[PDB]
Amino acid sequence: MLSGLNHLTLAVSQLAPSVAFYQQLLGMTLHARWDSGAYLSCGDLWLCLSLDPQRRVTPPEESDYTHYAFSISEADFASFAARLEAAGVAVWKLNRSEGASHYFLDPDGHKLELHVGSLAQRLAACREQPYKGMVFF
Amino acid sequence: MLSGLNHLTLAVSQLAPSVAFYQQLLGMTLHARWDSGAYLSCGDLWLCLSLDPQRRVTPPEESDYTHYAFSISEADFASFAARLEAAGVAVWKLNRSEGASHYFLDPDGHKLELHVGSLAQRLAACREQPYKGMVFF
Ligand SMILES: NC(=S)c1ccc2c(c1)OCO2
Ligand SMILES: [Mn+2]
Numbered sequence: 393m394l395s396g397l398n399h400l401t402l403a404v405s406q407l408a409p410s411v412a413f414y415q416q417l418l419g420m421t422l423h424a425r426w427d428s429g430a431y432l433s434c435g436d437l438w439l440c441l442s443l444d445p446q447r448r449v450t451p452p453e454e455s456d457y458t459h460y461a462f463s464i465s466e467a468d469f470a471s472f473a474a475r476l477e478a479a480g481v482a483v484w485k486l487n488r489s490e491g492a493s494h495y496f497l498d499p500d501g502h503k504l505e506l507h508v509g510s511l512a513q514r515l516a517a518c519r520e521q522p523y524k525g526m527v528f529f
Numbered sequence: 530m531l532s533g534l535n536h537l538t539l540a541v542s543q544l545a546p547s548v549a550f551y552q553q554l555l556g557m558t559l560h561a562r563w564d565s566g567a568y569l570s571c572g573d574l575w576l577c578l579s580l581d582p583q584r585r586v587t588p589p590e591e592s593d594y595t596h597y598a599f600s601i602s603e604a605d606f607a608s609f610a611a612r613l614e615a616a617g618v619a620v621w622k623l624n625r626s627e628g629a630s631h632y633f634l635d636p637d638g639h640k641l642e643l644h645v646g647s648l649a650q651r652l653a654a655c656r657e658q659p660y661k662g663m664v665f666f
């Protein structure tokens with residue numbers, strides 16, 4: 393039986409700017425670094441950055457909707473978004489769903505999100521206003 | 530600050546086979562589906578499958594090392610891996626370079642992994658068998 397997400401690994405083209413982005417800009421804890429990668433944590437999340445020459449710096453129009461959302465409190469959301477904006481971090485989408493969301497790109501074009509709200513909150517909203525064709529289990 | 534992974538969203542090319550893969554084959558809990566997506570959980574992980582016309586079925590030699598690992602116990606690891614193998618699930622990596630792991634592909638070629646062990650356990654193992662140039666903080 394699978395019990396959760398064990399780790400998220402992102403392929404990166406340049407290790408130093410990716411470490412700076414996740415550790416310094418985004419505030420994650422750096423636990424180890426080696427010639428070709430790094431291990432960080434963000435709460436329970438184990439993040440691995442893996443130096444990969446096959447990673448392309450990918451414009452958002454050229455990648456699909458796969459994306460990684462990090463939790464933040466409502467109270468902290470706006471100042472964190474403003475921090476990313478001050479740092480010149482690009483936005484790839486505007487929020488049009490329930491719960492605050494800020495959609496931003498990492499240095500290689502990985503699609504990231506700040507989101508406020510749990511699955512339970514989303515399901516409650518959907519039960520009141522179901523998406524087209526929605527069925528619950 | 531950021532507190533963990535709020536959700537993982539995977540773009541999928543065909544919703545029904547992807548739902549079947551994550552729910553039936555991997556055993557995740559299906560909470561809701563709609564014409565363009567589904568919500569599942571795996572322990573505390575919120576997984577969203579999002580129907581995306583841009584998603585391509587991607588062979589593993591064409592994608593970078595970005596991947597998603599799910600936790601499994603030492604007691605369940607081998608039989609779950611063997612069941613995926615017997616079911617014909619494609620693979621993408623064989624060398625265990627980060628501990629006890631099984632590397633497999635979803636129907637669209639998303640790179641998945643079964644892994645036994647926490648970040649703390651991986652750091653302890655790396656102290657004895659470190660990656661080249663490894664530094665611990
Ligand atoms: N087996 C299920 S729950 C199902 C099958 C097909 C569906 C669907 C749901 O909504 C759109 O088309
Ligand atoms: Mn999202």
Ligand SMILES: [Mn+2]
Binds near residue numbers: 399401596598627642
């Ligand atoms: Mn891994």
